[PDB]
Amino acid sequence: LESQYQVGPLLGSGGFGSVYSGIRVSDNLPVAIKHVEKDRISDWGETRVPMEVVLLKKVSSGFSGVIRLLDWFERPDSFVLILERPEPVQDLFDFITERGALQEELARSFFWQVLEAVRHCHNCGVLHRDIKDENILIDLNRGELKLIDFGSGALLKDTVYTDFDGTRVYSPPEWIRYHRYHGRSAAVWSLGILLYDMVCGDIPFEHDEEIIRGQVFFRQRVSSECQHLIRWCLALRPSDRPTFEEIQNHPWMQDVLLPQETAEIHLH
Ligand SMILES: Fc1ccc(-c2nc3n(c2-c2ccncc2)CCS3)cc1
Ligand SMILES: [Ca+2]
Numbered sequence: 001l002e003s004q005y006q007v008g009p010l011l012g013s014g015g016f017g018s019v020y021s022g023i024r025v026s027d028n029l030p031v032a033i034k035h036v037e038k039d040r041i042s043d044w045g046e047t048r049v050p051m052e053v054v055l056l057k058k059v060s061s062g063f064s065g066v067i068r069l070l071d072w073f074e075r076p077d078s079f080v081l082i083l084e085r086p087e088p089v090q091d092l093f094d095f096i097t098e099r100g101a102l103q104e105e106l107a108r109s110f111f112w113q114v115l116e117a118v119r120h121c122h123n124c125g126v127l128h129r130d131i132k133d134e135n136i137l138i139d140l141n142r143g144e145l146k147l148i149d150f151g152s153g154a155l156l157k158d159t160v161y162t163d164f165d166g167t168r169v170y171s172p173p174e175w176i177r178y179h180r181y182h183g184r185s186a187a188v189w190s191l192g193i194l195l196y197d198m199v200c201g202d203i204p205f206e207h208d209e210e211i212i213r214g215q216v217f218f219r220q221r222v223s224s225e226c227q228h229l230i231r232w233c234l235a236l237r238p239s240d241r242p243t244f245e246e247i248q249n250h251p252w253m254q255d256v257l258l259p260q261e262t263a264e265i266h267l268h
Contacts, residue, residue, distance in 0.1 A: 192233025
């Protein structure tokens with residue numbers, strides 16, 4: 001590990017562990033090196049590994065809008081994950097904080113890419129469970145978005161989930177009320193929160209009561225088409241929420257820019 005990778009500065013730390021910038025020695029490939037202590041691991045899978053490793057392996061085959069796991073290591077008291085690192089890069093949270101509410105053309109491109117990435121995970125049998133601005137990286141040169149942090153994820157199933165350790169303000173009312181949710185419909189809710197965040201520059205709900213009330217107020221000028229899509233994704237009844245197909249077939253989602261085109265217009 002220490003022979004294969006050259007460690008750089010700390011990028012961040014938190015519930016996910018500690019992430020360092022790094023370089024692969026063999027070919028100077030930019031990487032991210034994530035350390036997590038074993039006793040801080042709550043979810044295990046299978047060799048006994050963090051569920052995160054299991055999930056990442058399932059989604060890291062081939063190209064995608066997901067940050068890929070290149071390798072991993074077990075230490076006596078920790079696991080070390082080697083992940084892709086775009087450069088230059090900025091997470092969506094920082095980007096929005098910096099630039100404010102996004103133009104709908106830009107939000108369309110970003111949201112479309114997030115949808116394709118989430119579809120990839122689900123098709124690979126993986127549920128992310130923590131879709132939000134902080135867990136989305138922007139390749140600033142290519143205009144490509146990449147999903148990160150499967151640490152709260154789970155294998156995708158059609159039965160009910162009774163556990164959740166993702167972000168509460170992105171969590172659906174059925175979780176708040178009943179501690180029960182289904183994967184896809186819960187994902188769609190979080191995507192509704194995300195889309196609002198893109199076009200308004202902030203999330204629509206802070207309190208549990210606002211979430212379960214489900215009333216959406218717009219603080220920025222947002223097109224009626226976009227408002228409709230957001231409110232559809234944020235339907236109180238899970239079964240009233242759109243499928244991924246319905247979201248991507250929505251009138252607001254038409255004529256999306258290519259990632260490179262998005263970068264040239266909005267990022268370069
Ligand atoms: F180029 C990169 C920048 C951030 C990451 C990254 N990948 C993960 N986390 C972070 C991250 C790093 C720093 N601050 C916040 C999140 C958390 C769990 S998985 C990877 C590559
Ligand atoms: Ca947010």
